[PDB]
Write a protein that binds this ligand. Sequence first.
Ligand SMILES: CNC(=O)[C@H](Cc1c[nH]c2ccccc12)NP(=O)(O)OC[C@H]1O[C@@H](n2cnc3c(=O)[nH]c(N)nc32)[C@H](O)[C@@H]1O
Ligand SMILES: [Cl-]
Lengths: 112, 115
Amino acid sequence: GDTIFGKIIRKEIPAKIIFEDDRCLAFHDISPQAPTHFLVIPKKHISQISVAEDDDESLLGHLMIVGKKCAADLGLNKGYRMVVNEGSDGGQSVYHVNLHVLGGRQMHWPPG
Amino acid sequence: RPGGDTIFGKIIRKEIPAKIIFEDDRCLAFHDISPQAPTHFLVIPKKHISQISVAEDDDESLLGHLMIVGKKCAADLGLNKGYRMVVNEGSDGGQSVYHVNLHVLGGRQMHWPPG
Ligand SMILES: CNC(=O)[C@H](Cc1c[nH]c2ccccc12)NP(=O)(O)OC[C@H]1O[C@@H](n2cnc3c(=O)[nH]c(N)nc32)[C@H](O)[C@@H]1O
Ligand SMILES: [Cl-]
């Protein structure tokens, strides 16, 4: 099923876009939990990390590389945390694979 | 020595014991010694990368492999209600071992924000 992240990719609703290429999109989270909090999502609709295929390996890694490059561009030189949520226990809020990147403050432990 | 001399390098070379879940030529999954959830394990590359901020472009497939192995291990460990994957970078991330590692936590409701 389609999600709000599909609409964001299709430019049907606005988002503050940080980076885009042919296979992913990075944009600021609408409900930020840190001074910097953005998402990196694939344009391919993978609903959750538990159903990702082996052929998706490069794409998932690309999200992380784009994530760390965006983090550097946004000035997160003291570090940051990357998060992927799966399912109910993981607190996944949208069923479209999304990598959170949070920084600009001390991140704590446990991570939720 | 291959893997570096961080604690994770020692674990990769079997010089320090760990409770290993899965191993292949590219990575290792093993339980965290200080778990923050009923199930809490780590997936690390065998190639030493100190932190995600210095990962090279050609490390893409390897990083993605960590996540694929992570989700496969979570399934094998019965985390059917879900889980959270975490990478800590640097001081603000709380990184304490400078060998890239993916945390996988499950077996309870995880909360928001993630720290
Ligand atoms: C202090 N720092 C950390 O541990 C932070 C989390 C953290 C603690 N306090 C905080 C405050 C703010 C933000 C974050 C934190 N985790 P990390 O450094 O990102 O990941 C390294 C993981 O390796 C685990 N580990 C270390 N040694 C061994 C070992 O010999 N054997 C095994 N099996 N595991 C080992 C260790 O328990 C840890 O979860
Ligand atoms: Cl989510």
